[model samples]
Target: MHEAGEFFMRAGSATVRPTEGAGGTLGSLGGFSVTNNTQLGLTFTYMATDNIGVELLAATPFRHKIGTRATGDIATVHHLPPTLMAQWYFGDASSKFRPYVGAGINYTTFFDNGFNDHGKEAGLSDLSLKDSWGAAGQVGVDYLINRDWLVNMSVWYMDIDTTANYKLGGAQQHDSVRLDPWVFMFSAGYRF
Candidate 1:
C-alpha cells in the first residue's frame, strides 16, 4: 500500500512523436517537420500524502531529424525535456489498481544542432533552435503486483514551440516550428 513518506522510481523505454500543425514560416522552402525518437525514461516521485504525489520526469537525450518537403532531411538536433508534475491518485492505498492524473510544466532545450552535408552545400548554415517552456499533462495507471512492486503505463502531452534560426544563401531566416509531442512509457516500478 502507498503511504506518506514513501519514494517511487520507474525506468523504461519511452518514445516521442511530434504532431505538427500547419508547419511554420520557412520562407520559399515551404514548411518544415520534425522526426521521432525513442530513449530511456525514468520517473521519481515522493508521496506527500495518501493521494498526492510530486513527480519529476527525466530521460536521455532525444535526437531528431529536421527537414522540409523540398529538401528532405537536412539537419539533426538533440534535446532533453525535464518535467515536474503534481499528481492525484484515485482510490485508497490498499487498492490493487491506481489511476492518476497530473498537471505540470516542461522545459526543453536543444543542442548539437547542425546541418547535413547536403544542406551545407546548399548554403544553409548557422542552425539553432531556441529552447521552449510549456505546460504538460499526463494520465497513468499503476497496477500493484505486490507490496513494493508495480507496473505502470503512462501517456503525456507536451506543448513545445520553438524558433529555428539559420542562414540560407547568405540571408538569415527564422522559422517558428511547433513540435507538440505525445510521449508514451511503460515501466516497472519500485516503492520504498
Candidate 2:
C-alpha cells in the first residue's frame, strides 16, 4: 500500500483549435486557426491505498492565434484555460503502468486579442470577450520509469464558449458572437 499525500508537476504541449463559426463577425476581420502551445500543471493526490487515489490539477496559460487566408490581415490572440479536477486511478499495484480517468471544471480567459484588419487599418475598438467556464473530462496513462518518475499522456475535452462584442469608429457595429475551442495535451511528470 502507498502512503497518503503525493504531489506531481506536469509539463506538456497542446494544439488549440477554434470551433466552427467561432469567429462570428471576426470572421470577416480574419480567419481563425489552430496553434501549438505549451502547458505546465501541478497535481496533488490523496492516496486511499495502493490502487486508488484522488487528484487535483492546476495548469498554466495557453496561447493561440488567428491566421487569415488573405494577405496583410493576419492576427493572433492569447488565451488562458485553467482547470481543477478530481481523478480516480486504476492499475495493478505491482505493475509499472498506471492509468487514470478524471472529470473537472474549467474557466477560460481570452486576452490580448490583437487585430490586423488587412489594409483597412481598422482596430477592434470596442471588442470585449466574456470569460467562460465549463466542464472538463480526461483519460491518461502513466508509465513508471523509476520509483519517483513517470511519463504521462492524456487527452482532455473542454466545453468552453464565449461571446465577443466588437465596435468601430465609436459605434457598436456588430452583434456578439461565440468562440469555443478544443484543446489536446501530452505531458511528462515527476512524482514526490
Candidate 3:
C-alpha cells in the first residue's frame, strides 16, 4: 500500500489574463487586466481508489493591480482562490511517475479593493469588487523521489467572473468583469 494519505505544498507563478478586454469600445471599455503575480498554492489528496483521488486546493493571497485600456492604472485588489478537484492518475500505484486530469469548482473572494489617484481623477472613487464562483480544470504530473517524497507539476484554468461597483460620474454604477486565468504550479510532496 502506498500514498494512502498525502499532502503537498506548492509555490509558483500565477499569470492571469482578462482574455476579453472591455470589448465594445475603448472609450466606454470596461476592459481591464490584472498584473501577473507569484503566489503559493497547496493541495491535499485522499486516495479513494487506486486510480482516483479527491483533492482540496488552497493558496495564499494574491495581490493584483488593475489597469484599464482607457486609462493607466486605476486600482488594486487582493483575492484568494479556493478550489476542489476530482483527479484520476494514470499508471498503477507502483509507478514512479503519474499523470492526471481533474475538474472542479472554485470560489474567489475579493478584498482591499480601492481606487488610486488616477481613478479619482477619472471621476471614479470608493471602489469595490464582488466575489466570484466558477468551474476549475486541471492537468498535472507527479514524480516520486522515494517513498515519502515526490515532485509535482500542475496547471489549472478557471472561469472566474466578478463585478466592479463604484462611484462613477457622480453616480454609483457597476461593470461586469471576467478574470478567467491559467494557474501553473510546482511543488514537493510527502506521502504517508
Candidate 4:
C-alpha cells in the first residue's frame, strides 16, 4: 500500500499591493491617497497519493491603513482570505527529494472596516468589502530528512479584488479596490 498522509499546518506571509485606483482622490476631496497591505496565512495539506495532494489555507485578518500625503490622515481596514488548491508531484523512485506544482482558487472577505479621520474628513466608515473569488497557483519542493519527517518550502499567488462603500456624515460614497496577495511558506510534515 502507498503512504497516505496530511499536514496539520503551514505558516506563510504575503506582500500585498493595491492594483487599481491607488493614486487618486475621493470624489471632489482633491487629495491623493493609497492603500498599503501585508498579510499572513496557515495551510493544511492532505496527501491522497505519492504524486498528488490538496491544500486548504487560512489566515489572520489583513489590515490596511489608507493614508493621504497632503492631509496626513489615515484609515484602517481588515480582510480575511481562504485559499484551496490541488497539487501534482514530480520525483524519482531513487531520490528522496520531491517537487510539486498546483493550481486552484481563493476567496477573500473584508470585515469591520474602521477609519480615523484626522482632518475634517467626509466619508463613511460603514464600508465593508465584498467577498472576492480568484485564481491561485503554487510551486514547492519537499526534502526528506528521514522516514516520516520532511521539510518543505512553497510559494503561492492569490488574485483578489473587492468594492468598498461608506457614508460620510450621511452622504453615500464608494470605491472599487483590488488587492493581489503573494504568499511564501515554510513547513514541516510527517508522512506515513
lDDT of 2 by residue, 1-192 (tens): 244455666663444554655343444443446554444556555656554455555556655544435333345455554555556675445665777776655555555655445212665543444455555566778787777677766665534444444555556643333334656555666765
Which numbered prediction scores highest in TM-score against the true structure?
A: 1
List the candidate numbers ranked by lDDT, top first: 1, 3, 4, 2
Candidate 1 residue-wise lDDT, 25-141, digit = tens: 553433556556555778887887667887777876666666666347765666665666667776554555778877655666654557657555764664656666656666778
Whole-model lDDT per candidate: 0.66, 0.54, 0.62, 0.56
Whole-model lDDT, candidate 3? 0.62
**Clashing residue pairs for model 3:** 22-31
CA shift of 155, model 4, Å = 1.7
Q: Candidate 1: misplaced stretches above 4 Å?
A: 17-35, 69-72, 90-94, 115-125, 165-175
The regions of model 3 sitting more than 4 angstroms off are 1-30, 39-41, 47-59, 70-72, 81-86, 90-96, 115-128, 166-174
Instruction: Tell me the lDDT of candidate 1.
Output: 0.66
**For candidate 1, which ten residues in a row score worst on lDDT?**
21-30
What is model 2's C-alpha RMSD? Answer: 6.9
Show pairs that collide, candidate 1.
Answer: none
